[PDB]
């Protein structure tokens, strides 16, 4: 699809334009908080994190050309999604992954929640440094994004996606 263009190198990893204003990535690849990014200084944007999910909101659209997509909080187990892996070479691998159940993890010093998935099918699969690449699927007749890649199991086909879910309560003052 044209979409592959949304995926871009970022810090020590990758990230994704959900909308003109919204850029998501894996928190551990991101450059330190308050770094000048895409030629914007802090204050041009607002960053919300959620585990190892990291969302930048830009007051002014940074990618004006691009439509919004729906950003779900993970998806149902058994749904077949697809990871959009770009490699530094520019090579583009659509990896199919059947999504699984939730699962905690440690990124160093910090336990973080994710949805696991089991890569469907040699060379193949993921590497560290794919972190950030998105997981997306076709819900009925259109496409949504459900999380970002964080890591893959030493053993075989299992991968973890970080997810972002909207807050449901609020504290006062």
Numbering used by the authors: 3 to 123, 130 to 181
Sentences from the paper on this structure:
We made three constructs, NS6 1′, NS6 2′ and NS6 4′, which were extended by 1, 2 and 4 residues respectively, generating proteases that contain substrates that correspond to P4–P1′, P4-P2′ and P4-P4′ of the NS6–NS7 cleavage junction. MNV NS6 2′ crystallised in space group P6122 with two molecules in the asymmetric unit. The electron density indicates the positions of residues 3-181 in chain A and 4-181 in chain B, but is not good enough to allow complete modelling of the N- or C-termini. The two monomers found in the asymmetric unit are related by a quasi-2-fold symmetry axis and form an apparent homodimer with an interface area of 1,097 Å2. In addition to neighbourly contacts made by the two C-termini, dimerization within the crystal is stabilised by hydrogen bonds involving Ser 51, Ser 111 and Val 113 of chain A and Ser 51, Ser 52, Ser 111 and Val 113 of chain B. Although the C-termini within the asymmetric unit each embrace the other monomer, reaching into the groove formed between the bII-cII and eII-fII loops, they are again not located within the substrate-binding site. Following anisotropy analysis the MNV NS6 2′ data were truncated to 3.2 Å, 3.2 Å, and 2.7 Å along a∗, b∗ and c∗ directions. The anisotropic truncation of the data, with the new limit of 2.7 Å along the c∗ axis, resulted in a dramatic increase in the number of unique reflections from 8,555 in the “pre-treated” data to 12,786. Anisotropic treatment of the MNV NS6 2′ data also improved the molecular replacement outcome, with a unique solution found by Phaser in contrast with the two possible solutions of the uncorrected data. Nevertheless, this resulted in immediate improvements in refinement: Rwork dropped from 32.5 to 30.3% while Rfree was reduced from 42.0 to 39.0%. These statistics were further improved to Rwork of 25.4% and Rfree of 30.3% in the final structure.
Whereas ORF2, ORF3 and ORF4 each encode single proteins, ORF1 codes for a large polyprotein (∼190 kDa) that is processed by the virally-encoded protease at five specific sites to release the six ‘mature’ non-structural proteins (NS1/2–NS7)—and an array of functional precursors—that are required for virus replication. The viral NS6 protease present within the C-terminal half of the polyprotein performs all the processing, including its own autocatalytic release from the precursor. Norovirus NS6 is a cysteine protease with a chymotrypsin-like fold: two β-barrel domains separated by a cleft that contains a Cys-His-Asp/Glu catalytic triad similar in arrangement to the Ser-His-Asp triad characteristic of serine proteases. To this end we extended an inactive MNV NS6 construct (which incorporates a C139A mutation to knock out the active site nucleophile) by adding residues from NS7, which is immediately downstream in the polyprotein.
